[PDB]
Amino acid sequence: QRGSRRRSEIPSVAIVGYTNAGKSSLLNALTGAGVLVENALFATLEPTTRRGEFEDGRPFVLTDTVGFVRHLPTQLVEAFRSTLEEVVDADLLIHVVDGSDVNPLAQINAVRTVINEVVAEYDIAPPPELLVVNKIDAATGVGLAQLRRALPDAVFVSARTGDGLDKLRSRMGELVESTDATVDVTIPYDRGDLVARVHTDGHVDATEHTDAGTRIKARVPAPLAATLREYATFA
Amino acid sequence: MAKADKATAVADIAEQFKASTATVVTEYRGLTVANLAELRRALGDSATYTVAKNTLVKRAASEAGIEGLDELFAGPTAIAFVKGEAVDAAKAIKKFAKDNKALVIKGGYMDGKALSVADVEKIADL
Amino acid sequence: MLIPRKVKHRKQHHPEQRGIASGGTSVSFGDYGIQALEHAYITNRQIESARIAINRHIKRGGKVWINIFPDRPLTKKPAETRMGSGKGSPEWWVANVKPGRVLFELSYPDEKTARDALTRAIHKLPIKARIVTREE
Amino acid sequence: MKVNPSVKPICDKCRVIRRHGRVMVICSDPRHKQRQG
Amino acid sequence: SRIGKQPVPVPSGVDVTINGQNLSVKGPKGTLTLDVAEPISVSRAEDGAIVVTRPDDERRSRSLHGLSRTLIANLVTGVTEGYTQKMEIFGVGYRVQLKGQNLEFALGYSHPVLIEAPEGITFAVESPTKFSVSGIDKQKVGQISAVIRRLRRPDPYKGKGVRYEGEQIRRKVGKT
Amino acid sequence: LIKLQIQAGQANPAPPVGPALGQHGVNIMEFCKAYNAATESQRGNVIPVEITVYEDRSFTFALKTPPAAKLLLKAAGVQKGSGEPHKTKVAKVTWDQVREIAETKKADLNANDIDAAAKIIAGTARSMGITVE
Amino acid sequence: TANIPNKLTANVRTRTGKGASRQARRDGKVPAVLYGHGTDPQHLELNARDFAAVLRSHGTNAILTLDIEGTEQLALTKALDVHPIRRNIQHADLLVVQRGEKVTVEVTVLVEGDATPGTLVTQDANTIEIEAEALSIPEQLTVSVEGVEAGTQITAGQISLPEGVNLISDPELLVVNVVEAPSAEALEEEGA
Amino acid sequence: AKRGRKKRDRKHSKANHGKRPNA
RNA sequence: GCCCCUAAGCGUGUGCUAAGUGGAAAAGGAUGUGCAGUCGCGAAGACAACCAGGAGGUUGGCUUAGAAGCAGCCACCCUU
RNA sequence: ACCUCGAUGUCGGCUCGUCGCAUCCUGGGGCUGGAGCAGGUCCCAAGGGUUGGGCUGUUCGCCCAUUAAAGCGGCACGCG
């Protein structure tokens, strides 16, 4: 199923974190899904995905995984090895930690050493890690500045209230568009299976009706950017 | 499709004929609602207009002297009930006859007299 | 699930599945109902599983009545043991059903969605059953 | 084709017929066509 | 039965023959021969028509009513005016040529394929990308055109292959 | 035969409006300049514009009365439409106000009478639940 | 109201019991017994089809005019017995009445209307017993519920009875209860 | 269990009257 | 039990079955056929084929980019 | 606990087979979120084929090299 849905051009982002980190409600509040939650342990278990939406008008694959617990046996890690395959299939990995706690250094240390186990045994480059503190309304401002100084890649969020969601899309935007390869293609007149593709599948830069054809400066996704290299304007 | 609704139609159509003087009957087919909305504003200013069933007309025509259109009830029936002067609605429709040219007049009736298509043109001329 | 709070006797005989129903053969709370046509021991799981099925098709409004309650216990001894030496502990609670008994009842504005909701629950019961109305 | 004991019309353009002693559903959409057995 | 109610109108240009249930019609194109089912009987009225007669309302006899009427109907409009079907071929590099009583296709295969002409069926090429099949028997004309149309596995991505005249085939977008 | 509704003084973003009709082969820039030139007088609404297309790709665009679904909002003072009409009422509009909306909507509505148009606005008022008193 | 009594024929049975009754229902009849102030029960059998047609139109309480052996006899169907599975009449009780007597009869209650959108109408009492003249029984009673707000109770005393009839049952009995629309979580909470 | 079924189902014949030894 | 093996009926009358059902089986799926009763419609032409329309407010309100007559929720009225 | 206790020799391996199809390869197709290459799922099909080694008594399993494939079962858990 993934081997037929990876062929498409949908960016994939993964949300991971401890149990009762509010990862389920983050997907509910960012999209509008009615995924049910319980203020207890193992609120959600199935690997849930739904569409993601943006400020600039881009869809992506937003994947909710299973919640972790501390001192997990590797037997249970292997038991849920089916739910954690999306970790390496993620363009961007979003990490959410308990913002009301004492030791954000331990929360990142435990999960990252858990996830990099799978990255190492799957031998792919680790994704750009992003941390999201939750419950800024239920958190103390002293620790807010401590992670401000320590992690510039950290962002304050309170999904239970909804502050700073527009900045999340901007941060999500700059790091997802960054994997694409800008192209300068010249599509001829006998390949008219591309005019709608360059306008909606990718991002347009400029367009001119030259003699050799239409010199289409454009930005297109990874399976769509290494793809027009035949008609490249320079080496 | 209970018969009571059709029975009320037969009484009403005849009573409007006996309340009106003349008629002009054309083909309604192929005319947009935008045209139908445009015409109904001009149609209802003085006259009235309906698109009823041929047999509903016949059972609502046998009472009074509007049985002089039996052989002409074959085709798309579009009654333009002109109540006042018979030339008002006949002049407006001849505007639409030239405006559209997809409408062809089937016939008309006035003063208990049976006419033809060319006679109707003269009626719109009178 | 539905279980009784306390039952005077914990290990009872098997309920007799003979004869036709003599009570509860008329819908008396809602508008539509399910009428049984075969004897069965409808456990508390099939009662609750069918209850969710009706709710998931109306999803907004209406009330569901369950006139049947799993009172009787049914026991089983541990597997891979020879016969004799006692009687097993009660495991699943069932409710005796005789044909003619009205099992579930629904109250919903439009009939088509009401009957389709009931047909969803009927397909989760161990019996043949039909849909009966409030009217005569 | 879907070989199922329980073939039903799925869309509003699905016709259910009999062809050589088998109940089958035939539709414009190839996804819908199915036979009994 | 409503289909079989009306009678087949014979024209001035053919002669019919009814010897029991072996009805044969001959005219300006050919000679066609037919046999009907045993309940049904067929004769002709003196007003230039052929009539099929079912004596019962049994399910078997009611189905053979409509079947017999259309068969004689096509037996008449065939032996006199005949049938033609206009076939088209689509895709770059796809052509057709005529080799006497045969047809040669070029449908992207390594080997140019041949289609023989069954008797009473005449191939008539018009343009390299459009042709027509004509004949006397409606059953045979539609049979060979069906084989012709199936010379390429269906392609909904670009529609390459032999199609019918006013076809609107199902297509889809082949993206990735 | 296409349709659009664009903000008063702003236009040409890429998702909403530009490629929304540039996929059919019409003008992209003069339409925005012309659209601004006509609405600068009104400037306080949204307009359903109905561009009618022919073989020659040249546009024929017309400007209609502001929608009753939004002309009611400015008449009542609220900004967000009601999520539960007939259960919680959030806007106030007087029968006089409906007459005021009918005066603006007198040109492009099917209503033959002033009071009949008032009914039409009342019929639209029920779709978001705006109190008519 | 002037309820036209129905004409039904009857025969007097030669034999009774379960042997004779089962044969009657197989042959196409339906047994019944006529009693009342006459103090002499007559065992009759009606035509099964005709009696059902009378019941299908004029409700359960249908005034009957039996011509038993050619003699007129006004009667009122006191009670019915229906098999719960096959839904057929097995037996009927026919009480003998004469014009100008106040009987006590249970009649059904209908509900007509369309309440405000945030409510669900749950009818409690299917029937209600009234006192009416022998030939002027109301065949059904109506409770038009419309424009009612959150939960409102319509008892028997809110029913508009026709002229010359009385509400025997106490007016405190509740008939129609309109309740707020159950919430999407209430379906989950109720019954577990 | 074909053997166990074909033997029990042998009792529905005319000459056995719905009963047989060992069912 | 009565076509031949195999003693005695390829018995008589009225219907049903097309599956070798007769000569194994369930939940359930299903335009296979015979019988009985109902309901809506219809020579004021109901149904099938076919002609012509199938519009205005409008992009009905909340919701995310967005549901614009046509993922989701509420409302679901009016003029020709 | 019905046949066998005045005997019905019990696991693996070797030799030798024979059958079923609920098919691992080869053969024919329908659907596909099937562009191609390659797949996924279902239907038809028993003609032939289905390797050699390290560890363990091992069936089973893990591993090393390959191959079009290294099928699942029954026959006293076939065969003293």
Swiss-Prot record, chain B:
It comes from the Bacteria. GO terms for biological process: translation. Forms part of the ribosomal stalk, playing a central role in the interaction of the ribosome with GTP-bound translation factors. Part of the ribosomal stalk of the 50S ribosomal subunit. The N-terminus interacts with L11 and the large rRNA to form the base of the stalk. The C-terminus forms an elongated spine to which L12 dimers bind in a sequential fashion forming a multimeric L10(L12)X complex. One of its GO terms (molecular function) is large ribosomal subunit rRNA binding. Keywords: Ribonucleoprotein, Ribosomal protein, RNA-binding, rRNA-binding. Belongs to the universal ribosomal protein uL10 family. One of its GO terms (cellular component) is large ribosomal subunit. This is Large ribosomal subunit protein uL10. The chain holds residues 1 to 126 of 175 of the full protein.
Curated annotation (Swiss-Prot), chain D:
It comes from the Bacteria. This is Large ribosomal subunit protein bL36. SUPFAM superfamilies: Ribosomal protein L36. One of its GO terms (molecular function) is structural constituent of ribosome. One of its GO terms (cellular component) is cytoplasm. It holds the Pfam family Ribosomal_L36. Keywords: Ribonucleoprotein, Ribosomal protein. Belongs to the bacterial ribosomal protein bL36 family. One of its GO terms (biological process) is translation. It comes from Mycolicibacterium smegmatis (strain ATCC 700084 / mc(2)155).
From Swiss-Prot, chain E:
Keywords: Ribonucleoprotein, Ribosomal protein, RNA-binding, rRNA-binding. GO terms for biological process: cytoplasmic translation. One of its GO terms (molecular function) is structural constituent of ribosome. Pfam families: Ribosomal_L6. The keyword Ribonucleoprotein applies. GO terms for cellular component: cytosolic large ribosomal subunit. Belongs to the universal ribosomal protein uL6 family. Part of the 50S ribosomal subunit. This protein binds to the 23S rRNA, and is important in its secondary structure. It is located near the subunit interface in the base of the L7/L12 stalk, and near the tRNA binding site of the peptidyltransferase center. This is Large ribosomal subunit protein uL6. It comes from Mycolicibacterium smegmatis (strain ATCC 700084 / mc(2)155). The gene is rplF.
Swiss-Prot record, chain F:
Keywords: Isopeptide bond, Methylation, Ribonucleoprotein, Ribosomal protein, RNA-binding, rRNA-binding, Ubl conjugation. One of its GO terms (cellular component) is cytosolic large ribosomal subunit. There is a cross-link at residue 92 (Isoglutamyl lysine isopeptide (Lys-Gln) (interchain with Q-Cter in protein Pup)). The keyword ATP-binding does not apply. GO terms for molecular function: large ribosomal subunit rRNA binding; structural constituent of ribosome. PROSITE patterns: RIBOSOMAL_L11. InterPro entries: Ribosomal_uL11 (IPR000911), Ribosomal_uL11_bac-typ (IPR006519), Ribosomal_uL11_C (IPR020783), Ribosomal_uL11_C_sf (IPR036769), Ribosomal_uL11_CS (IPR020785), Ribosomal_uL11_N (IPR020784), Ribosomal_uL11_N_sf (IPR036796). One or more lysine residues are methylated. Belongs to the universal ribosomal protein uL11 family. Part of the ribosomal stalk of the 50S ribosomal subunit. Interacts with L10 and the large rRNA to form the base of the stalk. L10 forms an elongated spine to which L12 dimers bind in a sequential fashion forming a multimeric L10(L12)X complex. This is Large ribosomal subunit protein uL11. It comes from Mycolicibacterium smegmatis (strain ATCC 700084 / mc(2)155).
